[model samples]
Target: STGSATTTPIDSLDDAYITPVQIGTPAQTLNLDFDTGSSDLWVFSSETTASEVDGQTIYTPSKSTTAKLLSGATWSISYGDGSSSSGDVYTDTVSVGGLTVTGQAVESAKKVSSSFTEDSTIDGLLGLAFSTLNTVSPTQQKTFFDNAKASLDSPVFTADLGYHAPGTYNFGFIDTTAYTGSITYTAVSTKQGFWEWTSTGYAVGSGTFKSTSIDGIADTGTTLLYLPATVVSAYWAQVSGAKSSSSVGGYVFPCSATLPSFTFGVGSARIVIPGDYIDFGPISTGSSSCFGGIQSSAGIGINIFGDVALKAAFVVFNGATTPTLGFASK
Candidate 1:
């Protein structure tokens, strides 16, 4: 399957997305939400007191010979989910695939909530997302990507979210080997931190929504795709048994049914968000109803394309080449 790139205005934290990086030797891989909005690489430590850290992977500083701790340093991070974590400062030799960076700044969470503590598959977040968002003032510092950018082979980095079953997520240098055609590139317009863009409109199951023109940002941090009420209603109408729930102000649908295919048009490019992605995990608000991935923002003026949209394409942020963003597929 092939895909194209679209342009979006990026606002604070929106520009910062996760990047996959290698952590310990024998090199276990970790997907870190690199936030330019924040400047700390905090992984769940083995010392965490909460049970949420049980199944999740923890980075053991003791195992890393190059690890260095900042005695007086402290840190904390709060997400939109109302969950937070706090920790201390540490430095270690970090590696992103073949690129090995030394003296990289990181944070080890001393305290964590049930939400973050319970994540079993993910090790911890490597905040390449940004330096300005660093939790710790003096002891906390810039990301490994910022400090090591000068030495990286490719001045640019790209994120690829595989499409096939058991899809793969990759980071670091853009892999040309995966693409057979030329990739589309869009220059980033001067905007805030959120990855904002101008959308001509959207087409759902061959029907186009009226007044589709909208501006929004693409954020990996968020889980769902937030859009206007009309657009969302139009989308949910096509899904079987899809209904708007009062509790969350979003639509809920059966997970077993297939959702209609939807494509987003931005400038010359069109990106399709597959049906399966529209149905999120079993709803926590109710029994077995699954939360729909696309929701109505009630004209919040800011649209966010979260992980659902991201997992369908290979996204590239060209901070080094120019203020531009690019996209393609593997």
Candidate 2:
């Protein structure tokens, strides 16, 4: 109760990371995608239609002793990828790793779009975004983290996401051993319901780091890094034969191209994304064509520093005070 604990983040198919969350008194567990892009802990449940559920595990509120109905409550959420869900609401005990929050809002999906049903691995979404973005109506719900913040030793959490390998989500305390060097801190603008920060421009390869005000959110649920159109086009330009493809989506080039170092600044702190991490596997299995991790966020509605960028650094989601994000080399 006085310390921090970690939970493994299961890597999805070039999508995002999923972590285990315990719900209710009896502790029915479900694997959920920890999304920073949106808020609402909506889960597939007994309320969902049987035909639409497929093989996803569900939480039965009736099976938990502590579950209580939130009268006249409902929630619906839509994602950047057009995925969405709508559900009823309840107050239940929710826990992550060693931390627990009683009477946490748990939205039980009564209906879900194909975008959500198609993904059998993800039972639901555990939102880590600002509670302001929560979809619950009338009385907007607070996240488990927010509900438990006062009980925590320090009001914070850490995301240690990785490529393919299982990473961890730490609560309350920051493990000094998990990250190296001093943690570079940046103030966040939560007015947008995101960990929004201004990037002090970027540089490709050994090129000069130009200074510009590029704003973006650190989103763990988003699969790829999305930047400005000109910035994305510039990076792909350095690599021969790279072009945006509608048939396959995003920019793809020969998988063997020597990717250059992509560097960006958090205030005066310079963070470099390793060139190899830019290659987000082949366009299709066994295909020589590969997709660029960095793409244009122009039409996507928001600029996202997704897993591709976050995985390169140890991110400290500091909620202790004014909401600051601390970064360090892994």
In model 1, where is the ten-residue run with the lowest total lDDT?
A: 1-10
Compared to the true structure, candidate 1 yields what TM-score? 0.79
Give the TM-scores of the predictions, in the order they appear: 0.79, 0.95
Residue-level lDDT tens digits of model 1 in 1-330: 111222221221132233456665445455565442334678877656665577766777777776777778888778666778888877777776556777777677888877765555445666545455667856548776666667665655555543323333333466677554456666554345444556667888767644356776655566667888878888988887889989856798886778887777655666678787676657764567877888876745577766666656666655574555665643
Task: Please give the lDDT score at residue 317 for candidate 2.
Answer: 87
lDDT tens digits, residue span 17-68, model 2: 7788899978999988987777889899999988789889999999999999
lDDT of 2 at 264: 80
RMSD each, Å = 6.3, 1.8
